Amino acid sequence: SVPSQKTYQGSYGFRLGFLHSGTAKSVTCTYSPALNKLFCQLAKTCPVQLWVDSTPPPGTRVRAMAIYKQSQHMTEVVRRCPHHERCSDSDGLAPPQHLIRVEGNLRAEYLDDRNTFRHSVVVPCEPPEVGSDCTTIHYNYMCYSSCMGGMNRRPILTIITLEDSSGNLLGRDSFEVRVCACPGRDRRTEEENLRK
């Protein structure tokens, strides 16, 4: 099977937001609205904003999962490559096979789905800090898009789902991800290709 990627704001008006980081050579994470694509360095902080129009109930959670973007690869589980799964870079909570980690949240839970074998990471919803209008989750991607025996140059999507306490769908959004050494240059190149 394949997880749905259909954008769905749902009853709470759920959607993502991204910072405006630019495309300088030194940038470690940058989002392209024209491509709906995040470009980031390996294991660096990727701030993703969560926005709602109304407050979801206590017990609502936010889950992240990666799938391959190309249809001919969509049924294959996205996982870390044979090198990175063995490099003992554990944070003490994320299984070493998981591509996506949540940084700085001791309530993050990592799931290996017993039926689909897909990986995901889920956190409880928390209200914005006083003075803020949205909540941010900090993600890390733990392999390069190019890693041999893993993503192997195949593009991926991240699907972010807002879920109730039982895991039922409340909202969904998604974005493509490229994990690469020079996200600013790659964003500029791909946006130029799109303009041409």
Binding site as annotated, residues: 81, 84, 143, 147
User: Least distance in Å: CB of 104 to ligand 9GQ?
Assistant: 15
Member of 29, 40, 64, 147 binding Zn ion (CB under 5 A): 147
Q: Which residues are annotated as a binding site for Zn(2+)?
A: 81, 84, 143, 147
Q: What share of the chain is helix, strand, coil (3-state, %, to 5)?
A: 10, 35, 55
Distance CA 178, CA 183 (A): 8
Member of 143, 156, 162, 170 binding Zn ion (CB under 5 A): 143
- By beta-carbon proximity to ligand 9GQ, the closer residue of 65 and 147 is 65
Q: Does 47 bind ligand 9GQ (CB under 6 A)?
A: no
Segment interacting with Zn ion, rule: CB under 5 A, options 12-20, 34-42, 60-68, 136-144: 136-144
Distance CA 170, CA 33 (A): 24
DSSP element (H, E) containing 66: strand 61-68
- By beta-carbon proximity to ligand 9GQ, the closer residue of 56 and 150 is 56
Distance CA 196, CA 194 (A): 5
Distance CA 163, CA 129 (A): 21
State how beta strands 119-124 and 135-141 pair. unpaired
Can you give the three-state secondary structure of 102-135, one letter per residue?
A: ECCCCCCEEEECCCCCCEEEEEECCCCCCCCCCE
Q: Which does 84 bind (CB under 5 to 8 A by kind): ligand 9GQ, Zn ion, none?
A: Zn ion
Q: Does 127 bind ligand 9GQ (CB under 6 A)?
A: yes
Q: Which does 147 bind (CB under 5 to 8 A by kind): Zn ion, ligand 9GQ, none?
A: Zn ion
Distance CA 133, CA 51 (A): 8
Q: Which does 51 bind (CB under 5 to 8 A by kind): Zn ion, ligand 9GQ, none?
A: ligand 9GQ
DSSP element (H, E) containing 4: none
- By beta-carbon proximity to ligand 9GQ, the closer residue of 65 and 143 is 65
Hey, which residues between 136 and 195 contact ligand 9GQ (CB under 6 A)? none
The footprint of Zn ion (CB under 5 A) covers 81, 84, 143, 147, 150
The footprint of ligand 9GQ (CB under 6 A) covers 50-52, 55-56, 58, 60, 62, 125-128, 134-135
